[PDB]
Amino acid sequence: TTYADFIASGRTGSRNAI
Amino acid sequence: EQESVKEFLAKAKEEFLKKWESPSQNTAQLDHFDRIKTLGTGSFGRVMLVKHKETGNHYAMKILDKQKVVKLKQIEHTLNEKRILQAVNFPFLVKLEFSFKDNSNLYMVMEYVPGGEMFSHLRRIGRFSEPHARFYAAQIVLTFEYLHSLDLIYRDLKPENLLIDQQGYIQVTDFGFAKRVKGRTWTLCGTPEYLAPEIILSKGYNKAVDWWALGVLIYEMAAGYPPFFADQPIQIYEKIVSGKVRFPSHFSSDLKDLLRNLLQVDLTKRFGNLKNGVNDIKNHKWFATTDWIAIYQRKVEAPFIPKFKGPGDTSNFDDYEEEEIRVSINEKCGKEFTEF
Ligand SMILES: Nc1ncnc2c1ncn2[C@@H]1O[C@H](COP(=O)(O)OP(=O)(O)O)[C@@H](O)[C@H]1O
Ligand SMILES: [Mg+2]
Ligand SMILES: [Mg+2]
Numbered sequence: 001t002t003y004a005d006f007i008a009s010g011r012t013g014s015r016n017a018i
Numbered sequence: 019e020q021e022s023v024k025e026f027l028a029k030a031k032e033e034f035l036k037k038w039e040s041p042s043q044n045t046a047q048l049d050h051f052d053r054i055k056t057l058g059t060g061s062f063g064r065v066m067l068v069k070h071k072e073t074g075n076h077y078a079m080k081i082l083d084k085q086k087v088v089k090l091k092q093i094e095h096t097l098n099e100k101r102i103l104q105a106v107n108f109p110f111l112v113k114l115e116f117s118f119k120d121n122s123n124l125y126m127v128m129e130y131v132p133g134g135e136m137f138s139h140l141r142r143i144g145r146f147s148e149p150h151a152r153f154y155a156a157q158i159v160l161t162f163e164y165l166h167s168l169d170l171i172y173r174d175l176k177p178e179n180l181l182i183d184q185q186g187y188i189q190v191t192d193f194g195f196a197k198r199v200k201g202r203t204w205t206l207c208g209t210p211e212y213l214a215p216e217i218i219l220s221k222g223y224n225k226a227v228d229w230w231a232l233g234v235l236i237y238e239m240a241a242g243y244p245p246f247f248a249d250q251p252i253q254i255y256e257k258i259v260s261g262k263v264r265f266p267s268h269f270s271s272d273l274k275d276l277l278r279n280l281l282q283v284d285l286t287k288r289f290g291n292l293k294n295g296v297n298d299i300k301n302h303k304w305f306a307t308t309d310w311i312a313i314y315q316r317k318v319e320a321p322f323i324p325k326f327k328g329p330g331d332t333s334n335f336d337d338y339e340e341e342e343i344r345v346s347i348n349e350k351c352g353k354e355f356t357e358f
Contacts, residue, residue: 017174
């Protein structure tokens with residue numbers, strides 16, 4: 001599922017700029 | 019009513035430009051405040067909950083080590099951010115109450131926003147319903163109408179930068195990438211998930227990047243995850259420029275249509291960048307139930323009120339180890355920060 005893919009991305013925490 | 023908006027923004031510009039041309043400086047000092055607790059990590063030092071000794075009012079104090087700012091080549095960004103904060107005035111922008119500096123540090127004392135940032139609430143709750151997302155989105159629409167009218171481009175919209183106050187309303191924070199831009203600008207900056215294609219593609223760009231970012235924010239609020247994500251930024255960028263986006267099946271038709279027009283790779287077609295400007299967004303069917311004036315007056319009942327048991331409550335923030343704030347007996351980087 002798309003949600004599972006999001007968890008798999010490793011980018012579920014706060015995101016830094018740049 | 020339309021004439022009322024024009025009059026409001028004309029007066030707002032007059033007020034902004036006066037403060038922009040003659041910024042306030044040195045409006046308090048460190049020993050006017052008791053340190054209570056570290057609220058978070060700032061770019062160049064701690065963000066502290068502090069208590070004004072004379073009034074007992076609580077504030078969030080950003081502490082910036084001048085030597086670190088110089089080392090990371092952020093002098094202009096830091097001066098510009100403070101110059102913006104002391105000149106703007108809008109309900110959904112954080113409010114700079116005092117600023118000053120000493121031998122070691124720069125200090126910005128803001129109104130304390132006790133709900134913390136939207137990001138944590140969104141990840142906890144999972145996703146926001148469309149009414150809930152629309153309540154927040156309407157505040158961003160008005161805030162960008164305001165900022166863009168002053169020729170300010172914001173460039174860092176994301177849930178991480180949206181603080182939730184005691185009434186459940188938004189206060190936008192972190193103006194580290196904000197710039198006065200009448201035409202085009204070129205700096206690669208922002209957060210990968212929220213970058214407009216024309217930033218990724220190393221083009222000159224304009225305020226339409228903020229309207230793209232609004233589309234990303236609305237999508238993330240309503241889905242619980244952003245429209246473009248991947249293991250590494252480069253793969254995110256490939257998706258952003260591709261012209262392709264998929265929507266959860268629970269998105270309303272009106273929501274999908276708004277998002278197709280905000281997440282529009284073709285600048286000549288993107289809402290917020292057309293002849294009618296922000297009104298293409300404000301007049302869209304998804305916002306048909308939105309009372310824009312009631313939102314601005316904070317008269318709409320908020321869908322979510324953060325927990326808050328009186329002044330000084332920090333229950334919506336993480337805990338950090340507390341360290342002494344040391345101020346050198348010698349001035350550092352005085353020339354660089356004369357204007358602060
Ligand atoms: N006015 C405020 N009220 C409460 N917390 C704040 C306030 N300003 C900043 N913070 C805390 O500090 C964090 C970082 O603030 P931010 O505005 O992103 O500044 P910077 O990243 O430039 O140091 C926020 O996510 C929040 O936790
Ligand atoms: Mg910063
Ligand atoms: Mg920040």
